[PDB]
Amino acid sequence: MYRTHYSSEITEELNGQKVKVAGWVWEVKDLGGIKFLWIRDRDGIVQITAPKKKVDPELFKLIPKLRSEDVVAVEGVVNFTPKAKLGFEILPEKIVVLNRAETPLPLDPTGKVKAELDTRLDNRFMDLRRPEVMAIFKIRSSVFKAVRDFFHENGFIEIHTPKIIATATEGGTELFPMKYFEEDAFLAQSPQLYKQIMMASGLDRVYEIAPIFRAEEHNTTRHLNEAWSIDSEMAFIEDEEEVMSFLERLVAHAINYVREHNAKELDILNFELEEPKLPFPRVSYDKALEILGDLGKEIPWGEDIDTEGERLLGKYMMENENAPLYFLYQYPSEAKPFYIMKYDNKPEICRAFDLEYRGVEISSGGQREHRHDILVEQIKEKGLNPESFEFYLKAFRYGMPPHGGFGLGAERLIKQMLDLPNIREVILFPRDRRRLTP
Amino acid sequence: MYRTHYSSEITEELNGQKVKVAGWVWEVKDLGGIKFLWIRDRDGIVQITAPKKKVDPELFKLIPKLRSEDVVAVEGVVNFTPKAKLGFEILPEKIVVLNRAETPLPLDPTGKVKAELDTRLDNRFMDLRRPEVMAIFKIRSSVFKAVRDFFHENGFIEIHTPKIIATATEGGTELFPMKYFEEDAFLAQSPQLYKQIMMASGLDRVYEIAPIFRAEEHNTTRHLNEAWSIDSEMAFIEDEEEVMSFLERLVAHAINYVREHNAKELDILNFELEEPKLPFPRVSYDKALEILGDLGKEIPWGEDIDTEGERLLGKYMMENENAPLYFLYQYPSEAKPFYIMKYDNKPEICRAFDLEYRGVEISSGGQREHRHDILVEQIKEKGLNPESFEFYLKAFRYGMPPHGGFGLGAERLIKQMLDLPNIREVILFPRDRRRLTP
Ligand SMILES: N[C@@H](CC(=O)O)C(=O)O
């Protein structure tokens, strides 16, 4: 390897020792009797100091020849000094140019000249050279780890279901059709039917973090045609509140991990991520409609709360409860999927829920209808054909325990967490109505 | 929840205490003065003992009404005793029937009546109720966890790249053509182009575990049309051996985690998983051909080592080198992709490698050609058009460090690790030439 330490891995114990650093040329300052070279890596900048009387002559004349973004490797002696802005400097013994950069650059990695979002997406390798963009993708990785860790500690087993499907769905819209040899198939929009089927296997506690595809005809700042969904299904539950409690603890775990592990990144983003306050407020659909009505937003009982509604509610909850995260539950049965269990004592409402982060839905789920005959009738009530879901219904006939689960959007989770304006800021290569490349 | 403990979580410390167990009805012994009930959960069987003199009359009459595969929940007192084959029994206070099973069952959970692979695949919820099948999937989940942990411990950041692409990421044929609105697109066969682009971002050490899609015309026991690939790419390397060293340590970590944490599952499979011995032997393509020559298998230099060739070599290595795992390297440049770096001093050979497990390839990788102009020429040498790779090539123009990586098949790794006869045994819902549903 061309390096032995990253900028952040060099501490006081290494004073006076030889190390090897590598990265991109950030800045060169030829000041006559002394020269400076700044190298940038994933964690920061390293100062290479070259006093004329202390370095090799060929090295002294090589420095001013280095250009911005050239990939170089340096071996030298670590020297802790108050004179160095970051605490220490490297007195170079050997400098090697690994690869030279062309000019002009597609984007300004120094941040002076701002670039448009599409320019940044077309040149993602340049975009991440900026600390604030690198900060986002480091946090994204941390979020995925924290989530999986929580699942493991709670007895969940990771599963993997098919992305190429030829089965029926409740909506029948925004599906990406595709040919599978002689047959016609589609890309999966959710592992819903598969994770439910596995509740009849004994696995009991399952989770899957994989991509889902939806051919949305119009772009928004909240979704994309390709997303990473964090799915879970759990058996032997008594009600949907057990699922909500798990979800909030999961989300809280991810948020705290970022606060503990990525303080540097948060600081770079000039953002203060709040400490989760459990349990999050629960707001019934009825109560939500009442609050919105008083704010001028009138939604007829029975239909969905729209984009504007979520926004008004998220703001209301922040002003009245100082709650960036809260649940909406007890939705009308007519507004939710056929697989959600209705409240037996009040059939007009069901055991479904949605988790809102800063006014935007990041997750939805609920307790499912595990009783075969009732489930079949609910499919009929949706105006659908039960025979079309036979492969799925079959799993409910040979001993199916009570169960529930959720679907948590990874992009939406990170976007809302960092309070970013566009979902394209949290995924490397977005897919939308007009973007198929890179 | 209807359960507080799984069969495997009840130990000495809980003797005389109340617990709640739940699962599927395994066996009922209907006797005049006593009733025995055995229920099965994901970890095993638990005995429920109900003497007429000690249980509620209603509970006594309920037990003989239970049938095979009914889902039940039981609250009772833990009682350790030598009289119970499993060390303890539960003295029931309450029994709830959660759901009833129909007969006949799609498959036989007792293992008495064997069913063909196709029937088992058509009924996975039933199939996993058998200890030998559940064992494979618990192991699969462990392998994924071990891999991710090793990546994180070594400074690797997780990334997520597009599965819907315009440019074929691996080549001609064995590709899934799909329409992206007006544009023609394909399902990704690999994250290759994307993981390389990220090497110019400063991320340096990346990994991605996600599905890949390849349309092969013929069914075999070693491959499927949909698979999960474990990809990685690392920068600032000096040669492909640095990548091979990392890959063997990763695979070793995965094997040891299974040996250390899934001993019970291995026992159920009646399989002895060997302790990995590093470093694995490295065998050049030339030497592999020489060995095959000894065994009477003539392969003209430049050509691929076929299935038969792999078997003989794996057998030779196992029996002569005591190595169930070994690398094949220094392949003919003509036989490898345009993105692999050739040996500058001997161009007919390249810096590519393949990892063999029990005579079957589970991974391939190598050092890439990071030098822009040479790369463009290699794309031309393969009869491809450099313009079709504009987004990729642009990443090699503004400071791109030396780099390399690998693609590790998850299903192939697990199938070979457990020496299973068919790859369809390690993935829940297989996708092959004739299997599209479930
Ligand atoms: N992209 C290669 C693996 C690699 O070289 O990383 C493949 O699909 O085999």
Short mmCIF file of C-alpha atoms in Angstrom, two decimals, chain B residues 238-241 330-331 333 340-345 349-353 365-368:
data_model
loop_
_atom_site.label_atom_id
_atom_site.label_comp_id
_atom_site.label_asym_id
_atom_site.label_seq_id
_atom_site.Cartn_x
_atom_site.Cartn_y
_atom_site.Cartn_z
CA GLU B 238 0.75 -1.89 -5.40
CA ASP B 239 -0.36 -5.20 -6.92
CA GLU B 240 -3.21 -7.73 -7.09
CA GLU B 241 -1.69 -9.78 -4.25
CA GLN B 330 -1.91 -14.67 -13.81
CA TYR B 331 -4.56 -15.52 -16.41
CA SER B 333 -5.06 -11.25 -20.86
CA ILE B 340 -7.92 -5.69 -15.78
CA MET B 341 -4.30 -4.44 -15.76
CA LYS B 342 -1.85 -6.53 -17.83
CA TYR B 343 1.68 -7.29 -16.66
CA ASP B 344 3.66 -4.46 -18.27
CA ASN B 345 6.74 -6.66 -18.71
CA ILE B 349 -0.63 -12.28 -18.80
CA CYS B 350 -2.85 -10.10 -16.56
CA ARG B 351 -3.37 -9.23 -12.90
CA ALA B 352 -6.60 -11.22 -12.57
CA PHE B 353 -7.42 -14.04 -10.14
CA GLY B 365 -11.08 -10.03 -9.21
CA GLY B 366 -7.77 -8.33 -9.90
CA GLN B 367 -5.86 -5.06 -10.16
CA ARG B 368 -7.54 -2.69 -12.60
#
